[PDB]
Each structure stands twice: as C-alpha cells, then as structure tokens.
Amino acid sequence: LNPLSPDIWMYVLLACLGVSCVLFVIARFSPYEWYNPHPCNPDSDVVENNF
Amino acid sequence: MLKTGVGVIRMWADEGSRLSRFRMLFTSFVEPPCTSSTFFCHSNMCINNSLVCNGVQNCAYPWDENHCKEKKKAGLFEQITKTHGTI
Numbered sequence: 376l377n378p379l380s381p382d383i384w385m386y387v388l389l390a391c392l393g394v395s396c397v398l399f400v401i402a403r404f405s406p407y408e409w410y411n412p413h414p415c416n417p418d419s420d421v422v423e424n425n426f
Numbered sequence: 427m428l429k430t431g432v433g434v435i436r437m438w439a440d441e442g443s444r445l446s447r448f449r450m451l452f453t454s455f456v457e458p459p460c461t462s463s464t465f466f467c468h469s470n471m472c473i474n475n476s477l478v479c480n481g482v483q484n485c486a487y488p489w490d491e492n493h494c495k496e497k498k499k500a501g502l503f504e505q506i507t508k509t510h511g512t513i
C-alpha cells in the first residue's frame with residue numbers, strides 16, 4: 376500500500392462508491408436503458424432495466 | 427571540569443567594554459559507580475535523574491536529552507482537520 380498515499384486510497388474507495396451510486400441513478404433517469412430482455416418473441420410490456 | 431564541590435566564576439569587564447556577556451551552566455556530578463538516582467552520561471559522570479529530559483542539555487553530548495518526547499505514531503486520522511478533513 377506504500378506507492379499511493381493514504382489520502383489516495385480513501386479517495387479511490389470514496390469515488391468507487393460515488394460513481395457506483397451516480398451510474399445507478401443516471402441509468403434509471405435515462406430512457407434508453409429501458410428495453411426488453413426477451414428479443415425472441417415480440418413485446419408484451421416486458422420493458423426491463425438491468426442496473 | 428572542576429574537582430571540588432565549590433566553584434567560583436568572576437567577570438572583570440572595565441569601563442570601555444561593558445557589553446560582554448556569557449551564560450554558563452553548572453551541573454553536579456559524582457564519579458561513577460552509578461546507582462539509583464543516577465543516569466550515567468558515559469563521560470565519567472553520574473547525574474541526578476531530575477536532569478533527565480530537563481529540556482536543557484546538562485552533559486557533554488545530550489545523553490540526558492535523548493529517548494524523550496516520543497509521542498504516538500499517527501497518519502491520516504489526525505489529518506482530518508480544517509484543511510484536509512473538509513475535503
């Protein structure tokens with residue numbers, strides 16, 4: 376753990392939980408991530424996210 | 427390094443040179459077999475243990491002012507402050 380300062384090991388882990396929460400919110404806010412996981416048969420209101 | 431228990435220091439400064447100054451520092455010592463209430467600076471001296479970490483060096487090399495003020499190890503914990511701890 377020596378090649379990075381203990382300021383940096385906390386700032387990576389704080390950004391690891393930070394970007395994870397932003398990418399979750401920004402995928403639900405976006406309409407393009409909503410689609411069907413069943414492309415074989417046609418639509419039966421099966422629009423579903425993955426995140 | 428005196429041999430007796432009595433030491434006398436004088437200062438003769440005349441009329442035209444009253445700016446001269448000196449600041450000495452005596453230290454009582456006993457020749458070592460060093461015992462309790464001794465410290466043994468390693469220079470033919472037993473000094474009293476009140477002279478150990480006194481803040482002021484009393485032997486030739488600071489053997490008394492050594493291995494003192496060794497506060498606990500810290501890191502990022504005490505870096506939580508007005509500057510870094512806000513970030």
Ligand SMILES: *[C@@H]1O[C@H](CO)[C@@H](O)[C@H](O)[C@H]1NC(C)=O
Nearest residue numbers: 462463464473474475476477
């Ligand atoms: C050491 O010096 C102190 C004065 O600072 C004196 O009162 C004391 O008797 C001496 N001896 C011990 C064992 O403290």
